[PDB]
Paper text:
BipA (TypA or YihK) is a member of the translational GTPase protein family, to which translational factors EF-G,2 EF-Tu, and IF2 also belong. Full-length BipA can be subdivided into five domains. Beginning from the N terminus, the first four domains are homologous to domains I, II, III, and V of EF-G, whereas the last domain at the C terminus is distinct and protein-specific.
This fragment of BipA crystallized in the P41212 space group in the presence of 1 mm magnesium ions and diffracted to 2.5 Å. The structure of the C-terminal fragment is similar to that of the corresponding part of the full-length protein structure and to the C-terminal fragment of V. parahaemolyticus BipA. However, domain V is rotated toward the interface of the C-terminal domain and domain III. In addition, nearly all of the long, basic, disordered region is now structured, and the position of the [Co(NH3)6]3+ ion in the full-length protein structure has been replaced by two proximal magnesium ions. One magnesium ion has supplanted the [Co(NH3)6]3+ ion, and the other is close to the pivot point of the rotation of domain V. This placement of the magnesium ions in the C-terminal domain increases the positive surface charge in the proximity of the conserved basic C-terminal helix essential for ribosome binding of BipA (29). The isolated C-terminal fragment of BipA adopts an even more compact unit, occupying a smaller volume in the presence of magnesium. This observed compaction suggests that the C-terminal superdomain forms a functional unit even on the ribosome, similar to the superdomain structure seen in the crystal structure of EF-G bound to ribosomes. Modeling the structure of the isolated C-terminal fragment into the structure of the full-length protein results only in minor clashes between domains I and V. The presence of additional magnesium ions in the C-terminal domain increases the positive charge near the regions of the protein predicted to interact with ribosomes.
Residue numbers in the entry: 304 to 549, 551 to 603
Write the structure that this text describes.
């Protein structure tokens, strides 16, 4: 009985092997196979691609801890987004739901409830002790829960407790649950990101990196405020060049969003990957160049 699946792939980024010792198709397959010896829950299929394996676990959490200590072990790899495994029960198609149990200071209770609300979660139990904390229990589709561990930890300032586990399958919620609405900012080249470019770009959305970040072509470097994707230049600037042509301000950069693995997984769409190394997490389009992406969308 498995509930979520994703693809574990060899890291083909221009940066492969620069951060983790273990990068082979062989080494990854060997390591997955080894995991299957003590993980009853886990399923690993070879695919029509020698560099890609479809991995299925009890849920996203289980896949993520596996990715996380492959990281620790020196592995480099790319993963596709966690997809829930729909199942046809009777005639209707249904999706997995989890039970989440939370324990929070009352101070955080409103925010946490709101957030789970927004992720299509259903209040089942609410139980204050009289000492300032409160237990909540929700039932939420797996699809909507992905990403919440990190949200919860941040919004609770690390004081909250969270436990989630597969409950059951039920009729599918409607819509783009867990699905990013915005577009991404994609780097058009390889090099060192500079503040003079980032300064202009941060007007366009929210950046994932800052001055001095080493970047390649196809790497996703931020969130676009509009729904469409933007191929941008973060190696040299144009905004201040334009500013002097009227006014001038001082270059000040908003701190970048730093994303946990779980968040990177929540964020990416079908055409992207999370690049994962022992010391770094990156996001990229599957097709690294703008030329490739254009070709894909055309017929
Ligand atoms: Mg998503
Ligand atoms: Mg989108």
């Amino acid at each position: 009985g498995s509930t979520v699946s994703m693809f574990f792939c060899v890291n083909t980024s221009p940066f492969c092997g620069k951060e983790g010792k273990f990068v082979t198709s062989r080494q990854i397959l060997d390591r997955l196979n080894k995991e299957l010896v003590h993980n009853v829950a886990l399923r690993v299929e070879e695919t029509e691609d020698a560099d890609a394996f479809r991995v299925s676990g009890r849920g996203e959490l289980h896949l993520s801890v596996l990715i996380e200590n492959m990281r620790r072990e020196g592995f480099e790899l790319a993963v596709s987004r966690p997809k829930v495994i729909f199942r046809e029960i009777d005639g209707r198609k249904q999706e997995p739901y989890e039970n989440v149990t939370l324990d929070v200071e009352e101070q955080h209770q409103g925010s946490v409830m709101q957030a789970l609300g927004e992720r299509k979660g259903d209040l089942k139990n609410m139980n204050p002790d009289g000492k300032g904390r409160v237990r909540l229990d929700y039932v939420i589709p797996s699809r909507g829960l992905i990403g919440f561990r990190s949200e919860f930890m941040t919004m609770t300032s690390g004081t909250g407790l969270l436990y989630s586990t597969f409950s059951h399958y039920d009729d599918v919620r409607p819509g783009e649950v867990g699905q990013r609405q915005n577009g991404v900012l994609i780097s058009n080249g390889q090099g060192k990101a500079v503040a003079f470019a980032l300064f202009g770009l941060q007007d366009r959305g929210k950046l994932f990196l800052g001055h001095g970040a080493e970047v390649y072509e196809g790497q996703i470097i931020g969130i676009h405020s509009r729904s469409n994707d933007l191929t941008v230049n973060c190696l040299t600037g144009k905004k201040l060049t334009n500013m002097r042509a009227s006014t001038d301000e001082a270059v000040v950069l908003v701190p970048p969003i730093r994303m946990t693995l779980e968040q990177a997984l929540e964020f990416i769409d079908d055409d992207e990957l999370v690049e994962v190394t022992p010391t770094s997490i990156r996001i990229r389009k599957r097709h690294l160049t703008e030329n490739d992406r254009r070709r894909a969308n055309r017929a």
